[PDB]
UniProtKB/Swiss-Prot annotation:
<feature type="zinc finger region" description="RING-type">
    <location>
        <begin position="15"/>
        <end position="60"/>
    </location>
</feature>
<comment type="function">
    <text>Functions as antiviral protein and contributes to the defense against retroviral infections. Acts as a capsid-specific restriction factor with the help of TRIM5 and prevents infection from non-host-adapted retroviruses. During influenza A virus infection, promotes programmed cell death by targeting ZBP1 for 'Lys-63'-linked polyubiquitination. In turn, promotes ZBP1 recruitment of RIPK3 to mediate virus-induced programmed necrosis. Negatively regulates the function of mitochondria by enhancing mitochondrial depolarization leading to cytochrome c release and mitochondria-dependent apoptosis.</text>
</comment>
<protein>
    <recommendedName>
        <fullName>E3 ubiquitin-protein ligase TRIM34</fullName>
    </recommendedName>
</protein>
<comment type="subunit">
    <text>Homotrimer. Interacts (via B-box and SPRY domain) with TRIM5.</text>
</comment>
<comment type="subunit">
    <text>(Microbial infection) Interacts (via the B30.2/SPRY domain) with HIV-1 capsid complexes.</text>
</comment>
<comment type="similarity">
    <text>Belongs to the TRIM/RBCC family.</text>
</comment>
Amino acid sequence: GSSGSSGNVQEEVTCPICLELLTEPLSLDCGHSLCRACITVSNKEAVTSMGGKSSCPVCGISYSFEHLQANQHLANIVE
Ligand SMILES: [Zn+2]
Ligand SMILES: [Zn+2]
């Protein structure tokens, strides 16, 4: 019937990789939410070559799952 009401929200909480709905993603270091599957990797066939760290397919920024819980008190100024 009417348009414009109950429809004013702009949020980017959708896995840009698989292009699906997010139920409980994991905010990366750079600031991106992805699925638990798209991130975690089971099938590892990296033999001839080394390396094995979930990268950021959204933009591409080497991050880690430790820096988040590395510092709690001593925080650096950003602004
Ligand atoms: Zn996904
Ligand atoms: Zn990112």
